[model samples]
Target chain A: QNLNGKVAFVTGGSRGIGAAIVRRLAADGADIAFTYVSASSKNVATALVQELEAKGRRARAIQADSADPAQVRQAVEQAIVQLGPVDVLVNNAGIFLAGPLGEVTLDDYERTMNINVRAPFVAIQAAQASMPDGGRIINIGSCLAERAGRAGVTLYAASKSALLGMTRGLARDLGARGITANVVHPGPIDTDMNPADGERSGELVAVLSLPHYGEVRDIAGMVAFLAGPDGRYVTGASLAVDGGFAA
Target chain B: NLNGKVAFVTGGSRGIGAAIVRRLAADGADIAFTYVSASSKNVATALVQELEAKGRRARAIQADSADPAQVRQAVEQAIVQLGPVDVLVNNAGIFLAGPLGEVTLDDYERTMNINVRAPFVAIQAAQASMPDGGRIINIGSCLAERAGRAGVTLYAASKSALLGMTRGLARDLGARGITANVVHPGPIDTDMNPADGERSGELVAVLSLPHYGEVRDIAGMVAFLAGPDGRYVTGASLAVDGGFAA
Candidate 1:
């Protein structure tokens, strides 16, 4: 457990990739506080909390809509009180809104910018208030952010792509404090949102050097490495775990 | 000339933007570009006269790219004066840097407004009347790919946003046979970053070629992409840097 005394806060961690990240971080011996938006995830959060507790790691699930800045800051405060100052902040919450250019509306632009861009900005601002030296900030970006590859993903790609700049800015801003910030671009991970057996799986896989979807564990492992001691010298980097899809 | 096609360029009165306008005009494309202030207006007028003497049509509009309404209006102005824009180049930018703590909210907003949002707004406006097989070329920096050191956080962020924006434009416009791409220039010789500038030695040391590139080096890449030779390329970030990011 390299993260024996660290505290991690992840957004949208009740299911899918967020759940995997929470489990991995907890297993690595970090006290975890993750947010879930819906009441339906309450049971899943409770089960995850109990599971982590059985393993002697403190865990809490906060209900906060990531789109709301007030709730985001409140969640960070709650996490600091219940656990401790955040050592690792993972901005894993994002939404995929895709459409052609002419079909896209101003509302679509506002929502995408709010959730995918503003939430991470608010989370980092709040989390850094209590983050210790050598802290880690990881933002979950998409491979599409690098190469849109196909049609109907203009706004979605724009929002996800904004993370690269934000991460670089954070890295420069906090480097004097010995903190590091980076972005991880996941490609076609098999989740409920984009399943390995889904209709578009073939087209997605065709672009990858490895002809299949990656597991949630794949992304979790990378986050774990960045959060741990090994990634000390790495900052303002865009690490792609896309099976060479971007290549 | 791409058969005397019309081109719309932003910030085309000085530096790299001027070179791009000049080269595109030389290649047989009519040019419509923006100039911000009184001094730049003189330069723009002289450039228009220069191009017209060579049998090419050129017009310079007085518009600042920092405003979305102005960016959109610039495109409309170009279409009305020059005809449909076959090539749109987003080239106007500002370099603002400091420690993040010293960086003000105004700094953040201004840098992003010029470097990022203006490009998005320009593309949206230009693409409305851009014909089939049109080209959307964005001017990016090698810093977008790699921020080498301190004081480059905001500039790097703004430029890097174009990578994703380029990809998205490529995807959205691919069906219409339009292509979008970004060209990353590293330490090119300009008034903003002269080869004999104070930081030139430090920058040259990191360059594999050990020399600063001229403005034409970047304009050449844009010209090729605007031509038929670059038809197959889209959503690509081509680096004309001297291996600075290598």
Candidate 2:
């Protein structure tokens, strides 16, 4: 019951946790504009936009690869142009590459850092111009950002770690304006990348009390919460939706 | 302010930790605090009564954070007595300040047990019963960010450990609408580090904003983080120092 009359821009909203966020904010009464990595992307993105529109909420779908800083910056501007001013910005676009730190190439490293780190920063800088006093910035990081808990994710964790530092700095910078910034680190969710019913699911579930992988909706619920009225007071926090994987 | 929320602060019977307890109560939270030893039981009880007389709900439990089971149990008991905890302040830790070389293995284990593992155990146990939008606050030290001195290597490592744990806990609990954060204080006027201690001059000289901060400075930031406006802040390691980290 929050976010009425607000407009939200969510990146990587084609599928996975990002799509759920787009739906949630729109359900909460925000006009939503989302982005995809490719032009002719997943039907999920198209379906989601239509679904929100059917709910009598304005929705737009844009093709913008987050690996390109200018593209992500433009996506935010496009959202403001097409869906009115953006009150909430959800930086949910990230690429997870798993291989030993030794095996990771310069190309892999650059792309991951660019999309996972710089793109969000660019989007924030672009969005702030149109953001009002009570704007919300929600970032999607991974629990691996805190505890690698295993090997083969050094680069991925490092990229997300950068968000933790930026969120705190942004909070201090934006607090006077009543703006808030927060990040969420998801555990294993039933997404295409890491499906609950996947091969490694057992290894993931054995670590937590929850007994299984989280749904994309679990993460969506949090992003929506931060964008809502009840979450106005929180900024510069990191919450793990990882079912005690970090516990 | 906290208002009707129930808050649990570990090692809150005295010193900076106690100031956090007082601040939460002042903001009208129902507080369930912990003291390590039975010796401090009297002080804990008296503080509880004092706060209750002031029209706030408060309780004190005896549990050493060094014991993971006890730490977990403390959270469960707080929930049982106070309904569900809305704010959890993991402040119970020992100030083991010996030279890194002289520090015993037993000392390192004890410090690690209480400072790092204990808060994590408590947080994991608390969030189950904790309501949506609950807050987890950890008390770390500015030493975690900047060493600034010798002989505090192990102590700094133990405190710095909370920085990552706060982020991990934040990530794990965000789905349920809970926020986890860490607060680092500068050399405050605590019993462990008195403003006029032997190293007082060195401590004050390092501050860009020169002055020894009171326990209230740390408490005020804790209250701010625990308040309604802190909903958007999770996974942050905030320093309440007088520019010490600056």
Candidate 3:
């Protein structure tokens, strides 16, 4: 489970599952470069960098909005310049906007698609330019991508579902180079976006086989396994960390 | 798939769409379908006559599924001419394949516009006139479940979006007793991709069933879903692909 000497680039790594992924990768002996868009998250990103540095790992935080394709492409370049070549790239930045079809707007569609779908596409394209053979591209997705159990998630589900196809294409496009691409679908996890004590937590728990919201580390752990050497055989797969939400 | 029920199918000039139109009409439903190609108009006219000769009402409208306005217009035209649609089949889809590096923004937009957005637009327009016990069936590909192989990423992505979209539709329209489902077809023998095509061996080798599926196989599932047999099934992804996803 060690990633000694490897360099990892993660998106939206200032908080939540993204932060957990960065911390876990750094703990596994990888140098980390991650992005945060909001100015308020600077302190969190700085704090995370300091913590990782204290643990004897190199870390850098880049301010890049995933919604902007140019910024997404630039983030990969910044990561490569700061920490060396990225051995693994994790696309964890996403937005959850729930609204019925009648209520959703074109802007909502563009924004969600930009962040959840187009960003990863651009990131992978940019990363592939210099990404070494045997590299890993892990996308953070949602359980709703597989099953939209209710209404008001048509846009969100559609955006996330796009990853499944993009990852498959990446798997085949990069297969000759031995690069692997996969999606890690997180279920209801305890975070600011969807806390364990959230208003909808009970509804989520009722449907979950485990009857609880997963910790951020649960998703981070699965991501680490994929980023590490053990996950070489897995490619073009959608591995859900959803605790049987789709079951 | 019953007498007097109205069915509107998109891209019904040929292939799977054509098969569905014929089957649904054979089951005694009045049919309204849209065709994009100018040359396919002749084919569409021939199909309309066949259905009319069999005592079923049928009309072929000229519309491009890639255009949102056209899709909505076709549905409205159907409702005005054939009656309120009891079955809405989002069967039109553009197939985009190639290396990821070669895929352009134009390719992405066109594919999604037709494959993803058209279905959404059709449903929104169709649902207004649809009464109780309506059926919304979206055509999907087996690649949506398992990418199968390379060069099909964009197509797969657009198709997979239907899974979530259908599930969402299922919830939204459940109160009115409407059902939405996705049917994923595997490597079916068609004019676009024949059973004996150059890549037949490689395609067939991966499937649990050795042979390719007939177009009727997919139509049969659509008919079942449109009819009373699938009344209890909602938000489900039924794979008509010869165990391809399996």
Candidate 4:
């Protein structure tokens, strides 16, 4: 309820981390406009919109692929066109691909980099144009960027690592405008991306200093902190919520 | 020679910082390197070879680029072949455009990742192959990454942020082997990329608490750290920029 009238735009909000962000922001009283990859997911989006409406909050879901820079810009413009200038931009849309370095095709490289790296940059550029002072831009990075668990993760690690660079640069560029850019690196979270029951998931769990996998709520809490007023002074930081996996 | 028997490198040999690295390594340690861009600098290469011959060690020079993985690997291979790598020198760099938002997308992205992120990743990978006791020295950077600087300086700020990440990761990775540290170099005397005497030089000089630093002087201090005496230090950032930060 802290963000009574704040308008938020979340990318990739149809499912996974994006959905969690939609719910968290809505619960906090911000009007939300999220994008899904396809209209096929409209039912899910509609249900969430209904839930938000029941709470006297506003929510909408648009079908837009985050990978296309032009589409991403359109989405941001649409958000501003409808909900007013965005006060918060949650760049949570991303695709994850895992493989050894040699096996990563050029197409895979371009596609992954497009969704994870290019989209965030375009989103920031477009959002910043419409955002006023005190706007928040949070880029969702991965802990693997800090420490890519094993070999074959070079491309994923490199792309996420790009966000660390982007965050620092954006922080300085936008600091005077009262805009803050930061990265949230979540560790092994329990999601469809890395299911708890998936093969080798148990091995991954044992490697973490915390004996258990991170819950979706755990990440939602971190995001909530950043979206709140307490995070005003913290910018250009790449904090890991990995339960000591990086320690 | 304080760094006797040590191994060191200076990239961009035809430029300012590269010259300092050459002098520093020549002052003592066995030296090996790869030219950053222009490998035709026969005089620079000869001078290094002369120093190596005098010191009774070897000097090997190749053509390499810090941003390319293959080039970096080649340099590493050459260094290992010439001398055991007890110390590493990351002085090779490039700074072409400074036109903020006007900077082309390729230049902007490449500069940010290369100037900042690549160094940290390189250090991480290098340390994995390094012996228990090793030294890594990164060149000068400012506090701009943490504090906002006036300019559309995504590149410069990224460099500054690199220092912060370097400090944090140093503590975690220092446990096994190696000390990772940075030197914040202020203005120095050199002609390759001459300081903008009118804008940058004048402004920085007016704010200078000490004065501009000589390349050799900075190299001298680096030599000391790479020596056996600097084992206790790790994860610390030292400013050698004529008290600019003071």
Indicate which candidate wins on DockQ: 3
Per-residue alpha-carbon lDDT of candidate 2 for residues B1-246, written as tens digits (9 for 90 to 100): 677899999988999878989888988899998898899988999999989998988888888888898888888888888889999999887778867778999989998998899988988888888888899999998888888878888889999999888878777777676778888877778777788899788777766434577887677668767876456456767665654543
For candidate 4, state the interface root-mean-square deviation in angstroms to 1 decimal. 6.3
For A1-247, candidate 1 gives per-residue lDDT tens digits of 8999999999999889999999999989999999987778899888989999999999999988876777887898899999989999999998888777877765676577667876777778778867999999999999988878888888788778878877887887888888999999999898988789988899989989998899999999999999999999899888999999988
Stretches of candidate 2 above 4 Å error? B1-246
Clashing pairs in 3: none
Q: Which lDDT tens digits does candidate 4 get at residues A116-212?
A: 7778777777788768888889989888767654544555665676677668767877788888888899888888877978887887888889978
Prediction 4: B-chain TM-score? 0.80
Per-prediction share of native contacts kept? 0.58, 0.01, 0.58, 0.12
Q: Which predicted model would earn the best TM-score?
A: 3
DockQ of each: 0.44, 0.06, 0.52, 0.13
In candidate 1, position B114 carries an lDDT of 85
| DockQ-sorted candidate list, best first | 3, 1, 4, 2
Number of clashes in every candidate structure?
Answer: 2, 28, 0, 1
How high is the CA lDDT of each candidate model? 0.87, 0.82, 0.88, 0.67
In the range B1-246, model 1's lDDT, one tens digit per residue, is 476699989999999999999999989999999987867878899999998988898899988777778888888888998899999999998889876556555776687778877788888888878899999999998888777777777687778878888888888898889999999998899888889998799999999999999999999999999999999999899999999977
Better of 2 and 3 by DockQ: 3
Candidate 1, which segments miss by more than 4 Å at Cα? A36-82, A125-130, A165-178, A206-212, A230-237, A243-247, B36-46, B103-105
Q: Write the per-residue lDDT of candidate 3 for residues A105-184, one digit (tens) a residue.
A: 65787788788887887777778767888999999999999888887888899889878877887788788888999999
DockQ of 1: 0.44
Give Cα distance to truth, residue B240, candidate 4, Å: 3.4
Q: Is the docking of candidate 1 incorrect, acceptable, medium or high quality?
A: acceptable
Model 2: how far is B64 from its true place, Å?
19
True contacts kept of 3: 0.58
Tens-digit lDDT track for model 4 on B127-237? 555666778776645443233343434444445444544454455456656776666666665674345555555546544553455677667667766766778776566
